[PDB]
Amino acid sequence: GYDYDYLFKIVLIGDSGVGKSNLLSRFTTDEFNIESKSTIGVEFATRTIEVENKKIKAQIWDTAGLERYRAITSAYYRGAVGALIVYDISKSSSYENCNHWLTELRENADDNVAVGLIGNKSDLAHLRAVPTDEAKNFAMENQMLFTETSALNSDNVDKAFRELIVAIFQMV
Ligand SMILES: Nc1nc2c(ncn2[C@@H]2O[C@H](COP(=O)(O)OP(=O)(O)O)[C@@H](O)[C@H]2O)c(=O)[nH]1
Ligand SMILES: [Mg+2]
């Protein structure tokens, strides 16, 4: 990793418990943590991927519990060129709160940010509370990419991040 052509900062946002921290770990180091306690703070991790023979350092940010800390929250969004809004396919509240997250993006992130919607925990299909076609339509109406993922079993995680990175690449 001596060099890279671009660095794309991407923020993960969404309700607590949906799997953001595990999406970060699954994508960056192929790791998953079954632990149900949220870490209060901010972190980032990187992975380099290739798009059209260009090396892109994807710098993936994750946070919890700092919403009342203004400067840190500002720093969280600062410079982000992509965002993934994450809900839990088994928890309708997390999906219904996606409009809040879109609004947070509009109010805190740069105008040009490329956005993907992720319905995580697809392995909990027996507990599904959000129909795929409904969420897919909501994503389209709001100019968001859409993927259902399982951070737990890995399903579609690389796809969700890659598609967004390709989309960021086309814009810039
Ligand atoms: N079944 C299932 N559990 C998951 C998945 N992703 C995360 N979890 C679990 O859901 C809980 C919340 O995950 P976490 O990544 O901390 O969510 P966050 O609060 O959005 O950062 C933890 O117990 C995780 O192990 C998934 O895809 N499937
Ligand atoms: Mg977390």
Map out the domains of the chain as residue ranges. 5-172
DSSP calls for 86-130:
EEETT-HHHHHTHHHHHHHHHHHS-TT-EEEEEEE-GGGGGG--S
Q: Which atom of ligand 1 is nearest to the CA of 14?
A: 20
Q: For residue 118, list its beta bridge partners.
A: 86, 147
Q: Is 90 in the pocket of ligand 1 (CB under 6 A)?
A: no
Tell me which DSSP letter residue 37 carries.
P
Question: Are 13 and 99 in contact, with CB atoms under 8 Å apart?
Answer: no
Task: Name residues with Cβ closer than 5 Å to ligand 2, which is an ion.
Answer: 20-21, 38, 64
Q: Which atom of ligand 1 is nearest to the CA of 12?
A: 20
Distance CA 29, CA 169 (A): 22
Rounded to 5 degrees, what are φ and ψ at 151?
-60, -35
Question: Which of 11, 13, 16, 22 to probe ligand 1 with, by most ligand atoms within 8 A of CB?
Answer: 22
- Separation of CA 32 and ligand 1 centre (Å): 9
Q: Tell me the ligand closest to 17's alpha carbon.
A: 1
Question: Are 66 and 72 in contact, with CB atoms under 8 Å apart?
Answer: yes
CATH architecture of 5-172: 3-Layer(aba) Sandwich (3.40)
